[PDB]
Write a protein that binds this ligand. Structure first.
Ligand SMILES: Nc1ncnc2c1ncn2[C@@H]1O[C@H](COP(=O)(O)CP(=O)(O)OP(=O)(O)O)[C@@H](O)[C@H]1O
Ligand SMILES: Nc1nc2nc(SCc3ccc(F)cc3)[nH]c2c(=O)[nH]1
Ligand SMILES: [Ca+2]
Ligand SMILES: [Ca+2]
Ligand SMILES: [Cl-]
Ligand SMILES: [Cl-]
Ligand code: NA
Ligand code: NA
Length: 159
């Protein structure tokens, strides 16, 4: 068993309803238990800005699944919640489930790259992560508290 940390995002189709449904669905992942859920946060879109604000959260998920098996399940949940791929890079979506961390694992497979490649630059990932895991240390030894103390991230407001 290991603890995975998953980022949640939604900016379409009633984000509060999409995230609450995703949390129920994450509890149905086999060989896995939710440990902790962050507050929900209403965040301005990074990347393309011509889209609605996001509801962002994070979840701690204790699992004995393999990393890619966990990825199968989060992809499934997205697809089952009406996630449709458009050609636009970084367009709006009903649900996004990003594996931020999988224990202390460092993975760069075809389908899966962990830690999430850009999470240490995203307040919408790190603030909810700190709320559920203040003592977190990344695979490379960097402390989550230290990143947030040192680096400028806009203030996050709750939903
Ligand atoms: N840590 C991870 N969590 C989830 N998917 C990941 C992943 N690392 C790689 N992937 C791969 O990422 C592919 C594209 O996912 P998308 O959701 O469209 C990117 P996004 O989440 O919009 O951008 P971002 O990764 O910059 O946040 C997935 O099909 C999956 O194979
Ligand atoms: N607030 C908010 N904005 C979001 N933009 C995306 S697309 C990826 C992306 C692209 C460039 C960048 F610099 C940061 C994130 N996903 C988001 C999310 O979950 N929340
Ligand atoms: Ca994402
Ligand atoms: Ca994603
Ligand atoms: Cl899309
Ligand atoms: Cl979508
Ligand atoms: Na479960
Ligand atoms: Na656009």
């Amino acid at each position: 068993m290991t603890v995975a940390y998953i980022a949640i995002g939604s900016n379409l189709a009633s984000p509060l309803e999409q995230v609450n449904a995703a949390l129920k669905a994450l509890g149905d992942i086999p060989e896995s238990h939710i440990l902790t859920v962050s507050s929900f946060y209403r965040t301005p879109p990074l990347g393309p800005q011509d889209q609605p604000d996001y509801l962002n959260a994070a979840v701690a998920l204790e699992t004995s699944l393999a990393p890619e098996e966990l990825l199968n399940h989060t992809q499934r949940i997205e697809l089952q919640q009406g996630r449709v791929r458009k050609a636009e890079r970084w367009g709006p979506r009903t649900l996004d489930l990003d594996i931020m961390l999988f224990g202390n694992e460092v993975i760069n497979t075809e389908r899966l790259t962990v830690p999430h490649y850009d999470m240490k630059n995203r307040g919408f990932m790190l603030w909810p992560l700190f709320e559920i895991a203040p003592e977190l240390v990344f695979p490379d030894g960097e402390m989550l508290r230290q990143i947030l103390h040192t680096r400028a991230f806009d203030k996050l407001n709750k939903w």
